Amino acid sequence: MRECISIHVGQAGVQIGNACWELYCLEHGIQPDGQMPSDKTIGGGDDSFNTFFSETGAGKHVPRAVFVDLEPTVIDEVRTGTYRQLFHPEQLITGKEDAANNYARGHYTIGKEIIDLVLDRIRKLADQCTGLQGFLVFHSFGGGTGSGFTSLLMERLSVDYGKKSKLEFSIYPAPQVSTAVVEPYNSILTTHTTLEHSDCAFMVDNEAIYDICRRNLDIERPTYTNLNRLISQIVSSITASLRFDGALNVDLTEFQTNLVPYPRIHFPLATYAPVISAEKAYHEQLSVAEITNACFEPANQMVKCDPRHGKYMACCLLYRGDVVPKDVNAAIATIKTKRSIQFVDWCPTGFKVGINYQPPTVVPGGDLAKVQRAVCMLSNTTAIAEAWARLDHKFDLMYAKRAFVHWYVGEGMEEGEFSEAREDMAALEKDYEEVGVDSVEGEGEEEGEEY
Amino acid sequence: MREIVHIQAGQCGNQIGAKFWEVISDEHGIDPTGSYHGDSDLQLERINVYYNEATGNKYVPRAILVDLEPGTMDSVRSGPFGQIFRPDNFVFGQSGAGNNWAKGHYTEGAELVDSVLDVVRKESESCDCLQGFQLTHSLGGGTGSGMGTLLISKIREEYPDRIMNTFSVMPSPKVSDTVVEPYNATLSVHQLVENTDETYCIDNEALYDICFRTLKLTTPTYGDLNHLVSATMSGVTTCLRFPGQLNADLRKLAVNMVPFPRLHFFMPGFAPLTSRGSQQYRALTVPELTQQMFDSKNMMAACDPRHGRYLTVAAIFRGRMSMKEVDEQMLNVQNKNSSYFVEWIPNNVKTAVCDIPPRGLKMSATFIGNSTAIQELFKRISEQFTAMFRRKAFLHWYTGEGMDEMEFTEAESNMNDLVSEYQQYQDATADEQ
Amino acid sequence: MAGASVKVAVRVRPFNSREMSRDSKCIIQMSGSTTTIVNPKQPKETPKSFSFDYSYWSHTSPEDINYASQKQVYRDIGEEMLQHAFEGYNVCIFAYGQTGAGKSYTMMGKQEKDQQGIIPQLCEDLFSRINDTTNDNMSYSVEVSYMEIYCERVRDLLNPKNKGNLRVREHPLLGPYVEDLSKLAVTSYNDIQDLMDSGNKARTVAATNMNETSSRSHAVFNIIFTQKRHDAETNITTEKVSKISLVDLAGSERADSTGAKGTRLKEGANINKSLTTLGKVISALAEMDSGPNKNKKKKKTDFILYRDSVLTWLLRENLGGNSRTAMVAALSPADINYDETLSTLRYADRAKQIRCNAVINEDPNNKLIRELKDEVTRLRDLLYA
């Protein structure tokens, strides 16, 4: 009916995929082995929702996903894990060496020798769908595979399919902490394909999520599992409108129509308001106004950037649970009166709204409290440029002396591509500065004459 | 499937290899007879990295043992793990080099190198997808330095895309067990600078210092030093064998650690070390591991890292731990000691985490540092080498085997350039002139 | 020692038969010391632009104005560098380009021997100047050698033996050199032509998508030049010795262009590594030249680093020391071959990058209106005064 393929590339993509599919199976009542006894108990229903799962004759459901990597280590955990029977055996590993934090080994040399098989599997999966909505690629900047192979795959998909949407959920490098020394080269080289081919890319930062976990959930020593669970909640709130009934429904194309003003500024931030532990779930009302206010707090952003240093071009709110429209209108009206939050003068409306009835679920063994209301906010703003500028500086400090460059050219990339891109990133930074400027005073010269 | 071929030449390399295979066999639960008697399931998942499968569920390692005297082969065969190795890989001759580099690389080794290369090719062709090689040896001796450099040269010529490693025991400043050591160390470093992707520098003096001070041993012996080095060797390649939350192959360490092709001399380290009878006082946590790991007195290179600057650092953790703690601790180490890190690399600490810790340690970590202080070692060797070369101390033993004096000079020049290149990225500012 | 005065030159060739057959378009435009190039697929945003110390327009063959004639480029480079050579210091020429751009041409010239490249003009002036200058109280000696660098291995061309690898060495006083490298004496430029043709027949070449014949290795043609004096005394001595290194660089490579696997990618990777090292050393030499010239405080020794690749290692005497360097980069005029020209300009932009900019003029009607208003203002002044 309304199908979406999820493509996971790299260790970060595969692990976020594990979290996402755990959440989906818990949400629709599918056992880890693919069976759904709840339908047999009910005697018939549409629980086998076609947004994510495909049904066979025997009642087994297979997800619509394509996992990709170059290290067998990550996928072999899944092939012998709890969900070994859920997925199709076609997991698409390259039983060879990894790209090894080298964008080149993942777009020019080892990146081939696996792209054709991936595209064939995607072709089969897409043929199974009877009217597709779009794609959801999960990857991570910095990694060699998640940069190079993501770029190659997006190029081929854009050639083959063209008109279908393509969304990203990516882990941008943090301002301070990182787990690699050659990260900036990979990020800058990736930005071109992130820009030209993708239709709407969301970014998150591990440092911000660590701070959120420390402050809200009182977890002093979080690990990647908690971050992955949070990102999974975000994606579920994004896609909830396709699956469950609601008063106001928002399709994937409505996000794009309402959220991107111009083709080159499709980089919004995401936020999730009621992140609260079970112990603190009491002592609080968690009304609609409270969560709407919390969504705009600068401390709750999932990217280390201050919204107060820029302007909000557009916003989109997706509500889940026991929510009524009048409270939503009251909250939006309250937000519009504050002076700390600034809106560009050429978007007087600046709000999109969606309401869904199904409340969020709770993962057993998780750390999020059970709540009646929730909201996910997607904001297209100009603050994000600041983050790019920081990373930009780091790039220069390594490219003046040509550090770590012989590895990249040893695999098939002319020293030129490095600068040909830096320039592309600089052009993008120029546009964000240009769009946020207020319209020039009385933009059409001067008026006032005879009548 | 990432297969590693292991080679070892000379007395020192043979002894270290024996201890290393005993350690790895314990890790994967292989009996001395070669059968598997382990408990967990993950041990057989990646056994093919280091072992080949025989008929009756028996495993045999990929060791290749080389020497020019049969004494050490006899010692290794008559040992606790003598029968695990393949008999056809024991390559040896007679009338060894005798601390003479020329005998090892130009005269005697030229006869055995063909057989050794034949065995290496036979072992390598059977692998599914070879990743790299290894070589344990000592530079102060004849057979080790000579045959090791010759093997490295030939193998690098034959297989040019794979990763070559080496664990070399450098000559020490003070403790000396040979007199003609500097010639062998120099004429060798000349080849190691060219034909290797990573070299880890070991020194007896640092290991003795660790045993006397940290472990508090009263009678250290060579078994202990081999133990330390073997622990480090096992720690380096962990992510190929066991799963984890952030993997790092040999090639990733190669890419992240080396800024320029000729700067690949590393200082290794391992934590923790409770010295026994003091475990109950020391609480084992990630900050404690990071504290002990960066200490100047824990290194095995006999160089003070405080006299230079860290070009790059890598930390591989093994255990169950939180990633926030690791990232925060590395950031704190970088900030608090900002004087000792180069300024034109914005972040210079690679991190990796593996899930399966060693036999009886809740947590462990291994360290691979790359700093300019290592130059001191080369400088010291030069300060000896020329002192013996101005008056031609022991030269006739070398020229008698066919080696023109020019070869000696072409090398003192190469190592001196290495010291100069490291000295460039050492000053903590560069402006004005 | 002498200042590392590096000369950056670029030259555009005309159309070939295939390009003329197609309805191709010229994209390089020059003005002063700046060259600009456009995209056929992206004609909206802007042209890219570069600046070099010399820009040479050999596009239009019958053109009479601002034509970069071969005698002109020889006067620009070869005459001054031969003058430097006769002072006893080393000289190096680097030829760079991609199949088509027009490298060989600039190095050799046409076959009818009517318009001569750098090599014939330099060699004939060297020979002729000497033949019309030598006397009883002087002697001159000239020798030639020819080698190639392939996969970081040195191979000989003049010697017809089995092409085994040779071994680089480092004589303590004379610097790097190669054992068993054939060296021959020459008398006139016909001998150099014979040896050059014989060596060029032995070079390794492979076919690719771009061209059926593409250089897979660098080449070095060394001319050893020695002057000996016979003073009015029993002590007869060599005044000084100088070397001329004419060097052919293989073009930069991209799998996005040569899709071959196996040995072909490996050769391209090694070529790119060598090119990067060469650019790294060359730019550092220019910085070394520039620093003390500006502030008088030489930057210590910035100890340049050559022991990184065999190409820069063998040529240590020619880049460094008392020597001069000059580089010419060929560019092709097809609108189809965009990114080849872009990469060539980008890699040529190194080695004392020159500041480049654009100009852009204004609507002609507005300029005419402004001129008329200025004239009216002057006349109103012609009225006021």
Ligand SMILES: CC(=O)O[C@H]1C(=O)[C@@]2(C)[C@H]([C@H](OC(=O)c3ccccc3)[C@]3(O)C[C@H](OC(=O)[C@H](O)[C@@H](NC(=O)c4ccccc4)c4ccccc4)C(C)=C1C3(C)C)[C@]1(OC(C)=O)CO[C@@H]1C[C@@H]2O
């Ligand atoms: C607390 C406890 O249970 O006892 C420890 C112990 O006291 C300490 C001191 C151990 C002990 O090590 C030494 O005493 C030692 C002596 C000479 C040279 C090196 C070490 C130990 O022997 C070492 C031994 O370590 C292991 O078993 C590891 O798995 C280690 N493998 C081996 O030591 C080994 C040696 C030969 C054959 C097979 C295995 C290892 C570590 C990393 C990667 C691979 C393997 C352990 C737990 C201890 C004792 C027994 C006291 C230490 O060693 C290691 C490698 O763990 C020394 O520094 C650590 C810190 C430990 O706290």
Ligand SMILES: Nc1nc2c(ncn2[C@@H]2O[C@H](COP(=O)(O)OP(=O)(O)OP(=O)(O)O)[C@@H](O)[C@H]2O)c(=O)[nH]1
């Ligand atoms: N949020 C989150 N980030 C992760 C996770 N795992 C890895 N990352 C990030 O991913 C980055 C490493 O890039 P990866 O894409 O995982 O590298 P790879 O997929 O193994 O590909 P290669 O670089 O070629 O090895 C690190 O900087 C991490 O910050 C995860 O589970 N959750």
Ligand SMILES: Nc1ncnc2c1ncn2[C@@H]1O[C@H](COP(=O)(O)OP(=O)(O)NP(=O)(O)O)[C@@H](O)[C@H]1O
């Ligand atoms: N400036 C020029 N004026 C006139 N003809 C030229 C010019 N440059 C090149 N040519 C000619 O046009 C053709 C282009 O040169 P060509 O032999 O294709 O060099 P190339 O293939 O670019 N060399 P290379 O870069 O080493 O691969 C040849 O026939 C030249 O003689």
Ligand SMILES: Nc1nc2c(ncn2[C@@H]2O[C@H](COP(=O)(O)OP(=O)(O)O)[C@@H](O)[C@H]2O)c(=O)[nH]1
């Ligand atoms: N770490 C360590 N070093 C050793 C050992 N045995 C010898 N050495 C060192 O090796 C040097 C002599 O090298 P040697 O083994 O004779 O070289 P070979 O003769 O070619 O094998 C001495 O200076 C010792 O410091 C050992 O068991 N462990």
Ligand SMILES: [Mg+2]
């Ligand atoms: Mg990877």
